[model samples]
Target: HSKKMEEGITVNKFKPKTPYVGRCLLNTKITGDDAPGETWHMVFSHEGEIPYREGQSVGVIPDGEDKNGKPHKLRLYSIASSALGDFGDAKSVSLCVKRLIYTNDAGETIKGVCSNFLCDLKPGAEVKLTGPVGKEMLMPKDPNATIIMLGTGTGIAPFRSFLWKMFFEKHDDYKFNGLAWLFLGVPTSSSLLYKEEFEKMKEKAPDNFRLDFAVSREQTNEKGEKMYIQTRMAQYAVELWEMLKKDNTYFYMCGLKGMEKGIDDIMVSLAAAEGIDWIEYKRQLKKAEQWNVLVY
Candidate 1:
């Protein structure tokens, strides 16, 4: 993974000044109509070069300008498909975007500029695309490394890429023999992104893959508390700690920034119980490039 990181970063091939006008290939909603939020699975086809890898993100420049008449800013989204594309085609890329809608203090509804623009895109529409940016979330090159993934909402985007590369894609270059565990947190069961795909992967390789869901509004912890990702982690704290001790184990996290403190609190307690300093150990993991986080 370090060597992969050393391969140098790729950025701004399609810059804000001169971006690639990609055609929208597909735009389908992954979440239920009645779900709290709306997430769409979108694909874009580019004629020019738009190379990217798993864990990298792409920038979308919306068509309209802001209130001040300036151009809408580019919003970065995690690439949801592997570099080979959704159907193994090299000319396309995918993104998992949730439409952002909320009520402000004045009781007026607001929507995210880029997200709503993406969610409403139709097939064949032209989109200004930029970037294959970010490097902090790259997966390890080791085929036998244990991968522990934690994600919430659209944070599942990059993990979807990782899973596809690890289990779904028919490539021979990398065959995973190590454990891959995903702990996903969503508001309800209907909000589980790519639910069927994850289930199919688990069914096909039960030994190599594991899935755990923390549906906050629909489920509770053993202690009768709301089941957030941290609560779920607490349930398997011992086992997770054991896995963390292994040299080949890698941990990746994405989602709301608030999740970090809860996770760290639990790990601190677990590590102290075993006479280890959690902060120091986490520092080592970062130094080793074994801990990757991309939370907003």
Candidate 2:
């Protein structure tokens, strides 16, 4: 079930001590003004200093020191653009980040240091950046493979990169002609990230791309159940089960960790119906490099 994988998927050109400093070129909220939480889409110009592919991540070190009086630790975010970047050149990288601010157990309002730093950035600000790391969620070369992606909230980052590489860009080395089914779950319809880009992709490659959304707070299934990703997926379980049986289908799950088990639950009964052990079958997918995941 391997499409095409690059060795090291390009090397890490930057790190903590000797970080690559890039400038924020564009930063804006990708969510609706009334959305429950704040998620930002930011781009950093690297001038080809850092070569990153789809499904990889970069480390970001905020400008200031931490509460412990040391430099704030670097945070890794999945790149939201393809190898050529959102600007259609190899010199820029983008991020889809949700500003993590929430009330703690003690009722203290806490802010995620790195996320806030990234979200509050303005054009022309400097950013300490590092490593285009991660190889798990890579885009394979089989243009005709069935790519099942499950991502929630900002987890849409890597999927956006992959989709761009497949549909938006006109790269010479690769041409995609297969299924790229995505299930994006969010709290509300307004929070659906990159809806415009995805809608365009669908229009451009309807036969090859499929998009589904699960706005948990706003959508419901026929059974009157909240439309979490798994529940929405239930509508397609029959075909999804058939797809899983094929060697060309690859499963990718990202976003909140809890969605992991929920996905498995959707398939367990289907596999059982056919007298197949879902766990063992998934293990085979892992061994074959068909199952990819990155979770918090």
Candidate 3:
């Protein structure tokens, strides 16, 4: 396809030394108390300071200094809400963070400074934020382009933005006519990110949206093995390969860095059977702006 992506709209609005001091308007615990792990969904009011788009990221700096008497480094998180944000306004940005606090103690446990800082934020709290960075994972301009999203855990952030734009909002400038197939991997049902929202999207646009969850701890594939995202994807290998050959099919992968290799392994076998080099095919996809990735 000769379609171009909507990329690099806003970037590095604020740097580490001079980060934007935004207000934390909402900090919600998105998971259940009985979940295998916890995640936080936070919304910050940029107040016309940031004009960000979907699939971008913003940096957050923890408030306190470390034991070494130096300030903590900023952490970048995928933008969870759509361009309109959770409140359907352009005045804010949002993030989905994996709360890493473990054990009963706060500082005496396995915790991430940024995650804890962001998760513990209350309404009206000040947050040091920077950037609406990245262009690789942005959506294409083609309304009829098929989107395949592969994500895990909090990686649902960007996809949530994409789906909300395509399935939820009725845009005067844009209308999606193609499919949005999402494969989300989480350990359990309680940790399933954006479950209710995606369910609504599916019901609202069943013909245009497809949803699949790889609940590794609760689901299994045809091989009777733990159904990670790759395992679940393997079940549809034949169909996925066909779409991969389609010019309008866009592929996206996010979350843990290791998941990329897992998907590569599956695709490698599929490509080999067709006498094509997997890496070469991937490079062509990248050249065509059809393959997008953002991982941590």
Candidate 4:
């Protein structure tokens, strides 16, 4: 059966009623004055729960329309919170949104619509949203496996969700497998979101969690130039190869369109350099489902 153009309706689709008003709990400006401006960590609480997996995404429907009332655009963002609520009271989702900047030919500046609005929302204000769309891109239930998450920019959203899920589950169950390795990239060190939170997670699960940060503008080797996640992957080629060799290793790639190719090349080169056949290594990674890529 072709997944495309296929449709099915269950007996009852549990559609939760949106509160029509979600209040912001916290809105902090992460980055100082920069070309991209500050990254906002905003949390919204609704009356009911929005059932979702760790890595699932949701659509935010804007409040207004264009000049002709053509309707504001819908943006899909991965849920940054975990599946299990923080008890019953903390039944809310959080988002780490970035301020977008555009430049004209003359170098004039312009701000994004939804991003600006989200950044400007006050603490007591309300906003409208819908969804929790996306199931194909989600964290696997196999606890015995290893997870490799890759993303850049706001692409880190889903991984944030995945990490939080791991944290809470481990906290409750007192056991969990499936190591999580994250590869994140951004223009500068300041642009990286959840710096403190990610570090704290590391302190808790140092064995199962590994994070690699790539700040293009700030990262430079002895030879002064920008560095990216692909470079770091090559630097830690042996460890990456070992991670690939593990059974039930699941790789997750998100973010910009071309990231997967760069990672692929790096892996191929690393395999070749290790005196192993690239084709065989590639086959192994694929057969083990260690190359799950999600880019858009």
**lDDT by residue for model 2 (1-296), tens:** 34557665676779899999899999999898879989999999999999888889999999888779899888999999988998898999999999999999999999988999899999999999999798788887687889999998888999999998889888777798889999999998889999999999999989889999999999899889999999999999999988887988888989988888898897889999999998998898888878888888
* lDDT score of residue 29 within candidate 3: 90
Where is model 1 more than 4 Å wrong at Cα? Answer: 1-9
TM-score of each: 0.96, 0.97, 0.94, 0.81
For model 1, residues 1-296, the per-residue Cα lDDT tens digits are 38233365577777888888899999999998768988999999975388788899989999999899988889999999987878787788999999999889999998888999999999999999999788888888788889999999999999999999888877767788899999999998889999899999999899999999998998887679999999888899999999999889999999888888899999999999989999999999888887888888
Which of the two candidates, 1 or 2, achieves a greater TM-score against the reference?
2
The model with the greatest lDDT is: 2
lDDT per residue as tens, model 3, 1-296: 43555544878979988999999898889899878768988889998798888888888889999899988888889899888888887898889998886755455667778888888899999999889788888888889999999999988999999988888787898999999999999988888989999999999999999889998989887668998999999989999999999998999999998899999999999999999999999999999998888888
Q: Write the per-residue lDDT of candidate 4 for residues 205-266, one digit (tens) a residue.
A: 89988889988887875556567878766777788778777766777787878787888787
Q: For model 2, how big is the CA root-mean-square deviation?
A: 1.4
Sorted by TM-score (best first), the order is 2, 1, 3, 4
lDDT of 4 at 221: 54
**lDDT winner between candidates 1 and 4:** 1
**Clash pairs, model 4 backbone:** none
lDDT of 2 at 6: 66
Show the colliding residue pairs in model 3. none
Query: Would you list the C-alpha lDDT of every candidate in the order shown?
Result: 0.89, 0.90, 0.89, 0.70
Q: Return the TM-score for candidate 3, rounded to 2 decimals.
A: 0.94
